[model samples]
Target: IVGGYTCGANTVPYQVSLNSGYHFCGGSLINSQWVVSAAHCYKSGIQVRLGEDNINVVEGNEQFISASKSIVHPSYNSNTLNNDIMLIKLKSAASLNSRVASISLPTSCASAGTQCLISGWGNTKSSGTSYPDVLKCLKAPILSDSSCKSAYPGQITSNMFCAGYLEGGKDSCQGDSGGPVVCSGKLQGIVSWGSGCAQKNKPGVYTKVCNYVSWIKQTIASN
Candidate 1:
């Protein structure tokens, strides 16, 4: 099995093409017809590509996934980036090989303290470079439910998730704002926030994918 990471920045093409053209940070195929992405990545008339790095190499090959329509969580507040999640309906399913594929969502056991992996092309540290050598990754153990309040009290909400280094070194940054936090090979979280780029004393915050399943499903089904 592959370990740790495979994962983004904005404004550049990375080995794939989206007809409408969007900088997709995270994605998962729900079925043949749907893929989940962050609410921030939602752009009309855009195409999204997944599963490859080597942006300079471009794979040259592309996925051509189109944004037939998009729906952000009803409660999502763009200003705070709260409830920052979205579902995309593709006119047709984007096929996948082992190199590129869809991830399953966990239905039960959305508990704290579970360790998850987040991957992205973001900087190694807050002031670090734009992207990493390959897609970079860091294992972030979930904060104890109480630590959610203790570590970042008052910021805790039902939708927010927290993880990271106690001392701090690695994390997701700018282009990674709306990306994947993978665990058990299934995407369980979305990169939402962090203190400095990869600052110390501050871990990163993410959107709980499990909590938003209903919203994602309903949005796709309604459309």
Candidate 2:
């Protein structure tokens, strides 16, 4: 919730802003007609904005479109935060170009100590009001599931993984839900839940992307 740097325009082309009345979440453009994000980020009539790095200003490559529908994981648990993934169907296909592109999925599940990148426009400080005008990027490292379980006993499931500093001060906070966690240039995870933004020893929890590959494919095909 607290630390990250401003990223360049093309650094995370697949990143999209999920907006209701304001920018509240981040998503990845997985395809021309679909977006992948956290199930917890959905709001009725949410708009998806792509091909832009800045949140407050529009650019030439930006394409603003409404979501036709949203599908959350059937077993998403609000209490345990399990299966916190979702898909959004665009009313129309996003225009793909250099400034707007889809992210590649990970070939395998992430392991402990794998370095990754997270981008968002969420809160900069745990108790601050100001958010970044431009998209922000942060470096995160995956923590072992064992370590995650310690922080969230009986809550860490196979469908989830942990990433961020054990010391706190670096994480995805409020308004950053549903953002991508890219590792080795692949989508490894989705920002799902955490125990208070950047709290010590309580790293950010994410939806394990590799574990849901089949579900993602099946949902996309059937929908």
Candidate 3:
């Protein structure tokens, strides 16, 4: 995360690192056996690491579980990045503890200007390779839909929303995709895309989680 600080150990209990040998994306544990991530982060052999604070160290509190199955949104549009959400079923259920837990799904949409927390291990710089070993977090406010539309021109869609400082300072960058954007302690968004990390007027775009709540519930129920 750009212009963000390292998160305290276990403070973000629902945070998980989607790994394929290394941390490639961030995800949120929504249940004991299911994780919500971005479809773009999906791979053939993803290992989900829970209770992870520092990626470079072997934290004893961490739980490494393989993905038993992955279900990406069927109508996901790669070109426009619409419906960029996915669910991963863990090979085994995660043990809930002080260092690992699930976050509740949102019951309502976050209104404009709502301050939210976004955590990840994405790049710390807008232009270079400065990925952090520890988890980073940023506080960003949700932007109005019209404002987001103005920022991205015709690129913004209903399934997406924007959050961050319009003047630029903090944002979720690469490797942060599929991470949680918690509003009012509820999962409201998923770090999806952006023009550049923390760029002016190009706030980080997220998958509007509220829009897919039913889809998420239905998919989990059937699978």
Candidate 4:
């Protein structure tokens, strides 16, 4: 949840919903059978759903599948939220229909000031009772590491990056964990965590996807 507006259905085919009994986190379909998400979202018995905007009802374009396995980053730190990426191996590959597809991974890290796109079913505000049924999306400008470090001080790390407005109006909030942060039409980051939804000068933090490119490829190839 943050400052965002409802997006059209099937606008982002690579987007996936991670259900921990209910819709909680967001994910990105990187391959037919592989999903990239935040390591913090890892939990037994979680399910994956794709090709749908609303989570409450089933749509013909939607597909639900059990997660065969989840692999958390070996260096993941729950305390610092570093190396917060994870991958989900689906029991069966997702059917690549018009509404369901995979997104391209970034070959390199996104540069500062890059305006990226983020969408999720997270809360609309930091403290709000309402959760929308449709997916919400907004644009965020990536902050330079220096600026991000100035905002977060010692907490920011090399593996983590920041994106959003400094004055704070839009960002990913709770329940948006593991969602994709697309820049330059490529998967650049994964929604990891934030101090509060759209808080001033506290741009949302993400696990920089490019930093783990080799690891992701190796993991998926071996699995």
Candidate 5:
């Protein structure tokens, strides 16, 4: 995450690393057995690491669990990145503890200008390869849908919203997809795509989580 600070130990307990030998994406533990992430991050043989603050170090509070199944939204469009949410069912329930826990999902939509927190272990630079070992976070306020549409005309859909600085220098980048964009301590968005890491008039686009609350619940209930 560019222009962000390292998260404190266990400060983001619900944050997880979606790994296949290395961290590929970030995710949020929504329940003991379910995780929410970007649909684009889906892959077979995913290992979910909970309570991970540093990707390169063993913090002892980590819980490594395999994913039993992944369910991408039926209406997901990879071309436009709409409905970019996904659910992952853990092989076994996570053992909740001081350093491992679940976050609550959003009950309402986040309006424009709502200050939110986006966390991940993605690249720190917009143009190079510099992934941080420690989880990083930045404060990004939700931008108006019109502004987002202007930035990427004919691309922004109702299922997608933008957040970050319009001038650049702060955003979620590669390896941060599916990470949490939380507002008011509830899951609000899932990092999906952007023009670049953080470019002028190009804020980070995310899956609008509020639009899929019912889908999330129904998917979990039926599975």
Candidate 6:
């Protein structure tokens, strides 16, 4: 999604909407009670739709869930999307949950070479347009830490994990932002930045679950 800043501020990924037509990005079921996503994906008018099918809504049958509260990482800065995570407390737990199932976020996601699955309703091609509702998923092998640094250069950091096609043709593209990147049944990352969709040298960069362990644990334990 492109932003309307006069100086040409833009968003690299496409926006995915709820079945009711409102939009948000990635998400994970923390338990039967919580869903975690990104704050940037938070829009006042948007809704989170679960058990959706295809790239379009069922017309008048989307499940509606209210966001009771959203807790954004306190130090979040949009410039580089640092501390760019958020957890949404839903008004009610999903009673008809299926496609949206709870997952545990791990304490250690490996510094390099962790395998995982990434999914979204984004564009299939790097330069192609975005998909609005059709959810697509793929398996991705995590790249070594140094490889990720080489791929993205100095922009890569310890807080990030990389995955996708190195030879090109496969990737998590626009509309895939804030999506889930899971490993070994535990949610390991949140799809974030990448140079291009499935490009030869660039793989999708993610928010490492390893770094957020203490905070996430504290949050869960306290509540």
Number of the top lDDT candidate = 3
Query: Model 5, stretches more than 4 Å misplaced?
Result: none
* C-alpha lDDT of all candidate models, in order: 0.62, 0.88, 0.93, 0.90, 0.93, 0.63
Ten-residue stretch with the least lDDT total in model 5:
194-203
Residue 164's lDDT within candidate 4 is 92
Candidate 4 residue 87 Cα shift, in angstroms, is: 0.6
Q: Name the 10 consecutive residues with the lowest summed lDDT in model 3.
A: 126-135
Which runs of model 3 end up more than 4 angstroms from their true locations? none
> Over the stretch 116-175, how does candidate 4's per-residue lDDT look in tens digits?
889899888766656887888988889999988998989988998999988987889887
| Candidate 4 regions with alpha-carbon error over 4 angstroms | none
Candidate 5 yields a Cα-based lDDT of 0.93
lDDT of 3: 0.93
lDDT string for model 1 (136-164, tens) is 55677777656665667677677787777
Clashing pairs in 1: 8-121, 15-58, 18-47, 20-45, 20-46, 20-47, 21-46, 21-47, 126-197, 126-198
lDDT of 5 at 161: 93
**Ranking of all candidate structures by their lDDT, best first:** 3, 5, 4, 2, 6, 1
Candidate 6 lDDT at 89 equals 64
- Predicted candidate 2: what Cα RMSD to the true structure? 1.2
Model 1, residue 18: displacement in angstroms? 7.5
Residues 124-207, candidate 3: write the lDDT tens digits. 998787988889989889999999999999999999999998899789998899999999889999999999898898999999
Q: What's model 1's overall lDDT?
A: 0.62
Model 2 TM-score is 0.96
Of candidates 6 and 2, the better by TM-score? 2
Residues 111-184, model 5: lDDT tens digits: 99999999999999988889889999999999999999999999999999999999999988988899999999
**For each candidate, how many residue pairs have backbone atoms clashing (under 3 Å)?**
10, 1, 0, 2, 0, 7
**Candidate 2 overall Cα lDDT vs. reference?**
0.88
Residue-level lDDT tens digits of model 2 in 1-223: 4688888886789999998878889999998999999988867988999987777777667899999999998898877788999999999998888888999877788789999999888888865666876888989999988899998888889899999988998998887899999999899999898878888988899999998888888999998
